[PDB]
Design a protein around this ligand. Structure first.
Ligand SMILES: [Mg+2]
Ligand SMILES: [Mg+2]
Ligand SMILES: [Mg+2]
Lengths: 271, 277, 259, 279
């Protein structure tokens, strides 16, 4: 991935590692630490630091929120891959490795989610007037995005997808619920924590919604090869359209999350 | 005189009403149906009562504490939903009715449970009125600490990971009960004391009070769940003696407050001791 | 009471009868007229006129809207009983009778819905300056309530119900979408058309919502003998509650509707 | 005009973009999935084009007409979803893909069609900007009349209740084609011309234009079926059918004589295309 996004991801990884110190009882902290880093990286979390910087705040004030977002995503990822016993859900062709048993995984996801809210609540800076109101607003955004009408609705509907038989419209909706709302949440929170006005917040939100949906589609294009460029182009267009009005070094980068800049690498390979 | 049974029924009625209102049926219907199936099955509502009473005790009102009271019941509810799953306790019935995954499938039960956990935070954060933001945020933090890796989940994890043991002593048993039972009761009392505007010393007394009835919501409970335990490590001889000392220390913390204001908790504690379920 | 309510129903029917004249081509108007009157009455239309009068409007200001609401309901009723060939919608307990073929029933339901909007648009009095705004608002309310997220959602979710084996929470939701949204629509449109302010409209809207949900609850009681008075009461409570702030015969004439 | 094809493709692209935005997937997913399955399948979008071109013709702009342009395509789409059903034409395919009820079941196809019909009025009513409420309500009534018992539906009903005889004369055939095809083309130009601020005299010419090109379309189709069951050729012969088509095209074009020629040009080109197509 691009250098900028990779350096932001590493910062989040270093912050989570400093925040989760394996200690007694290791039966609790060992899996808590392992499952946090076993989940895939999500751009919903880097998008939070990026959006903050895009509106001029310091990415450091969006860190607790970027961490919380990854944590909520990770707990959902762990629960999504639990071996359930009743065939109530498809056993998605891709079985992943499991270091810990179902019970420990189940419980650990339950411990990881509140940890994100703990980090957010504890990051309130006394010498910062608007911290409480912003952190409160961001807790609401994240809890909604990881709630019954957000990511969980996506996970639930994803279970209805049937290989090479589900329409692109249906898969795109699942992606919007499972990934777009969370990405929209990260961009919006990063804007909020960086002082943006309601104007820039709503545009960055829409941006994350479209980029997150597209990101989910790209990852589902590996199990429903029919990924038409129409959809990709539609979302990409919808996304870029929301970024008009940010200009500059920072906005250039943000923009690249959705549209990779022209690079000799690409061309050379095709060569 | 204080009518504790009448007090409890009245709080439970207000809580049930607020819970039904907070979690309505909407799409995806089976996720919400599942949440409501376990959340609205009634019961004593001890955690919501602890929260409301702690808030009223320090001078605040019920309406301020209600979202937080519903949140702790939402957490309590999903922790049982997850505890009943095949990979955990594998129970087919609860309250005499089919367990959530038996009615909706395991996939819905896991997600409806996660939905209740997330919604607990959403609801306290968005619906709480009568308390400034810094205070609502402090409460969200306390809720998080009481149910996570240093609270409810830690108890559960240490408990399932300590099944194949035999060297289990008072320290191990205290860690489990304090975490899987006391931590959420402590959190319930604290959210209320803080939301009610309590001073730090009041919060501190109530935090200790909750820890004591927490452990008690057990020691007696063995002599309520059995008839690894305490009577196994000391026998009903000094078992029923431990609960009597725990109740006393609980009630001692309540001496900080005027006795008339303290009656609901003094009684929520004599029940919590002398209860058969 | 009963005569007030009965005269509202008769006034709507007489207006519909006046609006739909069987005439050439009879192959089109014969079924249009038949199916409109074969559909049972819906209280959503009654609520529309009763709400208009409650706020002080003249009954006629809401007649086109009440007729349009009956027509949307009638078309959905015809379509929901069509004999389909693929078993995609289980046939209703007592199967209704069909004087006309499925093609004619399907098409006529498609001709009845637009007739409601035609009646509304045509009811604008150019001598009344408030008509355009209110009628426009009312067309939005009705097309929404009869749309994919209103009544159509209830009709769609209703097919997932299993007699004797579906929870009351699920059935109540289906009743709220299938009947409740249209009853809320009726009450709201009546208020709007009688010239009420936003606060009254909202309350009348809420009442209609709970009322319609109750009424559907009852239409289904025959297939799920579990007629809990508990869900019945929780709802009348939210309804009646919503009438507080209107105090008078209406704050309780409406009460007659949740009896 | 120059590049009639290009003009049509650009109008269709804008409309396709507006349709996609107006009917998004949402709960209940099957209903919305069925709506989009038939609505977003592409096609010439002639009705939307007529509405937008009629609005621009009298000085209005595309943006004002777009919700109404989407609305007439919503009606057109659901009329086809309902027409494909087993109790009707009973078709398993439409343009190389399964028909709507074959993909989703007859129950959903019926409801999704009903949803497009209701949403067409909702969308025009709630989304139209750039027009006074009395004007919006007037186009809502025109849309309703163009598709009901004196419009599209009458044409469909008279047609299915007639597929049983032979004594079908010209008057009857014209009644079916006028209601089944022209009525909604007339609704499309009238919606656009009213929203564009057209005078009653201009609206009247556009209705006539639409009535002619609507009948022209069916006459030309019958002719082509012969070249390369009542039809114009069986009733008056191919020669007189061609003469009739010619007069209909001439009469349509005559209606547009007093408008700005550049603005009238696409409608004139549409009439000629309808008259002279090879298919
Ligand atoms: Mg158990
Ligand atoms: Mg056909
Ligand atoms: Mg022909």
């Amino acid at each position: 991935m691009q250098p900028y996004w990779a350096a932001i991801e590493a910062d989040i990884e270093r912050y989570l590692k400093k925040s989760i110190t394996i200690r007694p009882p290791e039966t609790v902290f060992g899996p808590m630490h392992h499952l946090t880093f076993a989940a895939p990286a999500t751009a919903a979390s880097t998008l939070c630091l990026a959006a903050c910087e895009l509106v001029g705040g310091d990415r450091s004030q969006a860190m607790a929120a970027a961490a919380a977002i990854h944590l909520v995503h990770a707990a959902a990822y762990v629960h999504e891959h639990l071996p359930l016993t009743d065939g109530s859900r498809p056993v998605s062709k891709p079985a992943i490795q499991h270091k810990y048993g179902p019970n420990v995984e189940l419980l650990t996801g339950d411990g990881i989610v509140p940890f994100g809210f703990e980090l957010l609540a504890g990051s309130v800076d006394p010498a910062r007037t608007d911290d409480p109101d912003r952190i409160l607003r961001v807790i609401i955004e994240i809890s909604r995005a990881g709630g019954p009408e957000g990511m969980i609705s996506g996970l639930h509907r994803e279970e209805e997808i049937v290989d090479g038989n589900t329409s692109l419209d249906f898969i795109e909706y699942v992606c919007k619920k499972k990934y777009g709302e969370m990405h929209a949440c990260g961009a919006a929170c990063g804007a909020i924590l960086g002082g943006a006005a309601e104007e820039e917040i709503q545009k960055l939100r829409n941006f994350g919604l479209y980029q997150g949906t597209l990101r989910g589609m790209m990852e589902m294009k590996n199990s429903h090869q029919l990924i038409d460029e129409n959809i990709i182009g539609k979302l990409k267009e919808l996304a870029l359209e929301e970024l008009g009005g940010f200009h500059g070094k920072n906005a250039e980068l943000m923009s690249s999350l959705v549209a990779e800049p022209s690079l000799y690498a690409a061309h050379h390979h095709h060569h | 005189m204080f009518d504790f049974d009448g007090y409890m029924l009245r709080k439970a009625k207000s809580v049930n009403k607020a819970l039904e209102a907070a979690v309505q049926m909407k799409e995806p219907l089976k996720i919400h149906e599942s949440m409501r199936y376990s959340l609205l099955a009634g019961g004593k509502r001890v955690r919501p009562m602890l929260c409301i009473a702690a808030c009223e005790l320090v001078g605040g009102d019920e309406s301020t504490a209600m979202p937080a009271a519903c949140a702790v019941e939402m957490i309590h509810t999903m922790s049982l939903m997850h505890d009943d799953l095949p990979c955990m306790d594998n129970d087919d019935l609860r309250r005499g009715k089919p367990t959530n995954h038996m009615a909706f499938g395991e996939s819905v039960a896991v997600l409806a449970g996660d939905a209740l956990l997330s919604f607990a935070f959403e609801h306290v954060a968005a619906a709480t009125k009568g308390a400034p933001p810094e205070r609502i945020v402090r409460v969200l933090g306390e809720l998080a600490v009481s149910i996570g890796s240093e609270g409810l989940v830690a108890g559960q994890v240490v408990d399932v990971c300590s099944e194949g043991m035999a060297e289990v002593g008072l320290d191990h048993l205290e860690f489990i009960h304090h975490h899987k039972t006391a931590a959420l009761l402590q959190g319930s009392v604290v959210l209320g004391a803080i939301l009610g505007g309590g001073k730090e010393e009041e919060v501190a007394k109530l935090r200790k009070f909750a820890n004591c009835i927490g452990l008690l919501f057990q020691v007696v409970d063995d002599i309520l769940d059995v008839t690894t335990t305490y009577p196994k490590l000391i026998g009903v001889e000094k078992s029923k003696e431990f609960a009597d000392r725990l109740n006393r220390e609980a009630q001692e913390q309540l001496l900080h407050f005027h006795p008339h204001r303290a009656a609901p908790l003094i009684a929520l504690a004599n029940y919590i001791a002398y209860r058969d379920n």
